[PDB]
Structure formats: C-alpha cells, structure tokens
Design a protein around this ligand. Structure first.
Ligand code: HEM
Ligand SMILES: Oc1c(F)cccc1F
Length: 137
C-alpha cells in the first residue's frame, strides 16, 4: 500500500523523481510555461541539465516526506502551509499540483509494479484540498 510505495520510490529516488516529472511534462506540455529552461529538450537532455536533476530530486524528496507524514493519505495542514508559503511557488495554482498527481497515478498504473495507485490518487486530491485551505489559488 501507500506506505510501502513511499519505501519503493525512495529506494530508486533519482530514477522515479526524473521519470515521474518527465511523465508530468510530456502529458501536460503547457506546464513547461513554468519551466522556460526545459523547452525544446528531449527527456535525455533534460536529465543532463543540472537545475532539472536537482529540482526534480528536491520535489520528490519533499513529496515523499509529505506522503510519509500523512494519515490515511491526508497531508498535515503544516506541510500544506509550507508548500503555499514557498517563494518559488509564487505563480502556482492547485491545478499545477492536480496535474502532477494525475501524471503520477497514470505512471503508477502503467508500471509493472503493485503500487497502490488508488491511494496516490486520494493523496493528490487531499493535498489539493489542503493547499486551497492553506491559501493557494
Ligand atoms: C508535492 C508536490 C511538490 C513539492 C513537494 C514541491 C517541492 C519543491 C521544492 C522543495 C522546491 C525547491 C527546489 C529548489 O529550488 O531547490 C521547489 C521548487 C519549485 N517547484 Fe515545487 N513542489 C511540488 C509541486 C510543484 C509543481 C506541481 C510545480 C509546477 C507545476 C512546481 C514548481 C516549482 C518550481 C517552478 C520551482 C522552482 C523553479 C525551478 O523549477 O527550478 N512545484 N518545489
Ligand atoms: O516541509 C516542507 C519543505 F521544507 C518544503 C516543501 C514542502 C514541505 F512540506
């Protein structure tokens, strides 16, 4: 289930962090509007670019801590506040987060693996609600 999935993802974190973010950017090409540096690059090129590797691993590190601190796929209000109050997310709306989690869930569905995709889908919808509650537009 959800907790084991966090351990699975952490066990190959750099490869999952990259592959899931790339699934997000390729499913939602207009999301590159927040990532000008990424435009006109193939996956393999992105995975050579220093800000890409470092950003993707920092997102997935923090994602997994918020998932690990959740109860029944419901994130802490404190983690939602932190995410809202981040200077880097100045531009962002919950729709950015909804899309990341749709891609994650669809990546998990297509994997050969026994990920609890139901629980990640629930986690993403609960995170979006929390973010709204904490001030994100
Ligand atoms: C659970 C979900 C997410 C977590 C935990 C998270 C976490 C983080 C963290 C820790 C940073 C700081 C990275 C750094 O600059 O060192 C960051 C930066 C950033 N995040 Fe997020 N993030 C999430 C979702 C999103 C989404 C969905 C977007 C855009 C669609 C986004 C866009 C950014 C951008 C643009 C930056 C800084 C500029 C750059 O990418 O280089 N984040 N995020
Ligand atoms: O505690 C944190 C951070 F330090 C960064 C992003 C999200 C989060 F919940």
């Amino acid at each position: 289930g959800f907790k084991q999935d966090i351990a699975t993802l952490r066990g190959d974190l750099r490869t999952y962090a990259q592959d899931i973010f790339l699934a997000f950017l390729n499913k939602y090409p207009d999301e590159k509007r927040n990532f000008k540096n990424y435009v006109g690059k193939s996956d393999q090129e992105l995975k050579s670019m220093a800000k890409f590797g470092d950003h993707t691993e920092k997102v997935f590190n923090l994602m997994m801590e918020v998932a690990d601190r959740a109860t029944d796929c419901v994130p802490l209000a404190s983690d939602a506040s932190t995410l809202v109050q981040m200077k880097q997310h100045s531009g962002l709306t919950t729709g950015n987060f909804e899309k990341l989690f749709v891609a994650l869930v669809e990546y998990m569905r297509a994997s050969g693996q026994s990920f609890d995709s139901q629980s990640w889908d629930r986690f993403g919808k609960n995170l979006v609600s929390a973010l709204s509650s904490a001030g994100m537009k």
